[model samples]
Target: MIVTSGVLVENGKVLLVKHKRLGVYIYPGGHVEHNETPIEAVKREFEEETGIVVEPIGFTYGIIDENAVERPMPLVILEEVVKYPEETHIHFDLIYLVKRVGGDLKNGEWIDVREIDRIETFPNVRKVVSLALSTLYRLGKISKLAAALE
Candidate 1:
């Protein structure tokens, strides 16, 4: 299965959702349905989960069309193991870094980038948040000293 997620960051924090079933804090995302590209899926999933429209930043793996306009690339790709009562499978998860641009925030909380370790979340969730924060710092969106102070 293929899944897509987005890391929305602003004000030195990353947004995370507390999953009801998994009981773990996670980035907002969902499965990539048929006829939808991973890029499209991530945008849809993020909005659906958080009620916030996000804009992807930076380069993607490749272009969505032949025009050579590059799409936004995922910051991380995770091969996740999943188990259900009926079966088990592996999910190829694409994680994108994004910034909130519009819509109302809902169903999630923002975590201080420097204090992510204090959150009870999936290990990969923590890793991705950290990665996104670091990227923002490198991109000059967040100050290095501010990131360190969190």
Candidate 2:
């Protein structure tokens, strides 16, 4: 299945949601609908789950359109093995880097990059967070050692 996730960052922090039922911390995201593109899916899911507006920076992978417009590339692509009560499947997950554009924090908390190790999250959350912070540093949003010292 194709799944999309948004790693929302601001002020050197990342927004992370704690799943109510599963009790796992993850980025706000979900499966892509047949009618929607991955970018649309991430935007929709982030709003639905976090009650916030995010602008995606890029994607881990993407394609060029007929008009030569390149679709957003994902920051990371993860092949995850998911298990259900009666079945198991692989999820082709596209992760994107995003910045919070608007809205209130409805579901998750913004955690400092340095404090991320204290949270219980998906296996890749730490890596994603590190990448996001580095991106911020490169964009002049943070200092060189801001993420490195974390």
Candidate 3:
């Protein structure tokens, strides 16, 4: 099983990587090595990929099974082949919230801090952005609008 983790920023952004092998934009994470916990692995990976050192937020989400189909860049595949055949082959994603402690944002290579609504860059990010905003609203981090559209 691939025990991986990611940092979903409160700024409505997520740390993603353009995997060399997968050739897709996926979260900045890797398989948990021997004698290392998921949290430790994630913290190391997030910094390496995004150039921002982060501490574990200690909250984890359940495993999300990928269905195994391909999509355009910057969009997570709904289906994916299991890397490991022993266990469920599902990844254990540990989502965290981190503050920007250090490091400059690399524009085209390492780190790209993109807005959630920047559809021009990656159109597929809209769904995840919407979900993230909804989460913030539910957590009281953002105020909900009471006005009617009609």
Candidate 4:
């Protein structure tokens, strides 16, 4: 139904893993659990999958009214057909471009952009990663192009 994902781009590399169950290399994230907001879900899922704490930079300029609580904006949203042995459904995902803030990576690997094409991942991931790279560059977090700037 719904999933929250974090695209952690650092040093021109992105964090990913071949989903143990899904069997596809993808960004760190998972389904939102009971009683949690999407933002909370992403933060928790990112940490759980990659063993690192991260923060999402806001894309929302906060031009909203005082009555509203602004949150970090997602870099993109995606729809994927997730199929299991007995069922299939569209997984709508909220994807956030995140910054690593704490902890160490206990799983997955940082894949440079050059090698992403060879990875058997969802078709959308390559572009999502590219977007994450540019976002980091524009944020003044990186100097060179995406793959080796970290």
23-133 in candidate 1: lDDT tens per residue? Answer: 788888889999998888888888888899987776656655766677766888998876667888788998889877898988689888777788888657777777786
What value does the lDDT take at residue 99 in candidate 1? 78
Which residue pairs collide, candidate 4?
Answer: 11-150, 12-146
Error of 3 at 90 (Å): 4.6
lDDT of 4 by residue, 8-49 (tens): 876667899778877889998889887999988988988888
TM-score, predicted candidate 4 vs. hidden true structure: 0.88
TM-score: the better of candidates 1 and 4: 4
| TM-score between candidate 2 and the true structure | 0.86
* Pairs that clash in candidate 3: 66-79, 66-80, 67-78, 67-79, 67-80, 68-79, 68-80
TM-score of each: 0.85, 0.86, 0.53, 0.88
| lDDT comparing candidate 3 with the true structure | 0.47
Off by over 4 Å in 4: 63-68, 147-150
Q: At residue 134, what lDDT does model 2 achieve? A: 78
Candidate 2 collision pairs: 59-73, 59-74, 59-75, 60-73, 60-74, 60-75, 61-74
Candidate 2 regions with alpha-carbon error over 4 angstroms? 59-68
lDDT of 3 by residue, 7-126 (tens): 354443455556655455655666778888766786677777767676543223433457543211211222224443454355544443334566654421322234433323222334
The candidate 2 region of ten consecutive residues with least summed lDDT is: 58-67
